[PDB]
Amino acid sequence: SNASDWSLSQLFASLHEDIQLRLGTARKAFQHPGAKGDASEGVWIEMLDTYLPKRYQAANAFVVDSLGNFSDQINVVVFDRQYSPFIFKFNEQIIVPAESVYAVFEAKQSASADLVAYAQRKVASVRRLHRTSLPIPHAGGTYPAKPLIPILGGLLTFESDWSPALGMSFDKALNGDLSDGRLDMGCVASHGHFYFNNIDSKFNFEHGNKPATAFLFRLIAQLQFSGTVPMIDIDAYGKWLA
Template sequence: MSAWSLSTLLASLHDDIQLRLGIARKALQHPGVKGDASEGVWLDMLETYLPKRYQAAKAFVVDSLGNFSEQIDVVVFDRQYSPFIFKFDEQIIVPAESVYAVFEAKQTATAGLVAYAQQKVASVRKLHRTSLPIPYAGGTYPAKPLIPILGGLLTFESDWSPALGSSFDKALKVDMHDGRLDIGCVASHGHYFHDVSDNTFKFVQENKPATAFLFRLIAQLQFSGTVPMIDIDAYGKWLTQS
């Protein structure tokens, strides 16, 4: 009989995330360093456990009209079908068409942070995205509809009491459009998600929130399908700009 335990393995995934976030909170005093450490924990988890068709990075997002988003802590984007990515030193820029999800990652959830995250997410969703018809041996498929870009918030703690209560819900409902934060995790308490069936936010308190959040994110990404066929020529025109 195997000595492996699936429940133990899944619990260990969360315990590792919570421990590393806790160390960043307690041991690192400089706010910028602490923030970078928190982002790194979430990025490492997503890079390790998301299917390889996805990549996660801190990045800017650009569209074919030359518009840029604000810098996003965690961008989940396509690496299989997205034909290019720009990287210079630590600065990464990805095309808007390749983006599946964007997250703000910080130590503690507050009303101010929720509003800030909504602004960041909106700066991505407002970008122009192309979608070309897809040729195949028997003809051409119509251009694929644009997939919704998921937005979210990732923290270790919450300033509210209870951590996942009415105050959090009220903050999330301030922007239910371009800045909507569809899914997120407070690693010490639980995770939340936007339920499209009744247009409300559901809060789930469990023992292993990071693992539960990861599974829910993967499930939602599965329903997103594949990113549209990008119009490379729309980006290529910028080669002639001085």
């Protein structure tokens, strides 16, 4: 028909449906574990690359600090490049400084106790890294060194192994690490999303209502509180030239 009545809700439905279908395809079509994970990770990266404000980069990377310590391989890193160098780039492979990182996510097919714990360990391998912070020159003078921003951590999946998908067993797993490995938010594309409520100090689950889009908006809103990364002391890295 020729009817035209724009709908904002429909836009958010279509955004989510695209993610859910492509994650489902990645899982069904690729029977090789490496290709299946690469395909699924790429769906989440594309969503963040498309929709996050351009102050954020989203990519697979290793994180390193000025003490020479390295993270594990991080499936989805959200990081700064406006004010931050790469530490190393070789074709498409990148190593980013800890000071550039805003958020880190583990992307896997289905939520489980083992996967939640794995993600907690990945997040901890980043949060343990040392971050420098220098006084910041700007048009109005020099700000004090910015206090270190929280690094957001999370878990991105297509499905849940639990029944109900987002139930007490998922909550138990999330409460397994409330310190260096704490997961601030995550998405189960087929079911809902979760986030840590700092005021109540508990995890909240939200069912349905366009899970990937709801996760994306939660991430944008929480990232706003972080502002920009602190200003890196590249000369701390330079101690390793000799």
